Design a protein around this ligand. Structure first.
Ligand SMILES: CCCCCc1cc(O)cc(O)c1C(=O)O
Ligand SMILES: CCCCCc1cc(O)cc(O)c1C(=O)O
Lengths: 104, 104
């Protein structure tokens, strides 16, 4: 299609004390936001397998499609997102966010 | 689906003195590798528009689709990939590399 949607990419390193089961619950309760936040179109996630980044050991990648930067911003301030971020902020050591329109 | 795939994700910050013309050369030559390295099935890239990574400053995202981690390895050691580094390594200040299978 000719559409011009925008991807929201999250790259995450959890604190060392967070267990694998806790990471799984974190991801599960994040994906559930799709059922609550209108702007959230779809979610994919993955765990890195090559561990190539040395001291910057991010492990988890989450990708969400949105209709525009403005609706990404709607998602950021939605109370279910604010509430998730508040209570799970101590889970992560490093967080990177990117909003972009993929191109050839 | 019937096809398996792994995503190869590159996150990049250029050095401050690199020009927009240089970034365009870099990116065009990278995306052209699909004509040299058959393992590369798709390449999409984009530039972050939000700029909210206060601690790091990454700007560019490149996503390459591969069939498997084995064909990613073929790409890494391919002479044209080594050669791309030979000519363009001096262009980036920071780099992150990830390999993952996206899932729901
Ligand atoms: C699965 C990780 C969710 C991270 C939640 C979050 C926290 C924050 O401080 C800033 C953000 O832009 C986001 C987000 O993009 O959702
Ligand atoms: C367009 C970004 C160029 C990155 C080239 C590169 C450099 C490096 O030091 C390690 C790598 O795994 C890669 C790569 O995966 O392609």
């Amino acid at each position: 299609g000719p559409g011009m949607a925008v991807k929201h990419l999250i790259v995450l390193k959890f604190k060392d004390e967070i267990t694998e089961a806790q990471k799984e619950e974190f991801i599960k309760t994040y994906v559930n936001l799709v059922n609550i936040i209108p702007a959230m179109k779809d979610v994919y996630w993955g765990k890195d397998v090559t561990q190539k980044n040395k001291e910057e050991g991010y492990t988890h990648i989450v990708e969400v499609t949105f209709e525009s930067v403005e609706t990404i911003q709607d998602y950021i301030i939605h109370p279910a997102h604010v509430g998730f971020g508040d209570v799970y902020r101590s889970f992560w050591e490093k967080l990177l966010i990117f909003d972009y329109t993929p191109r050839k």
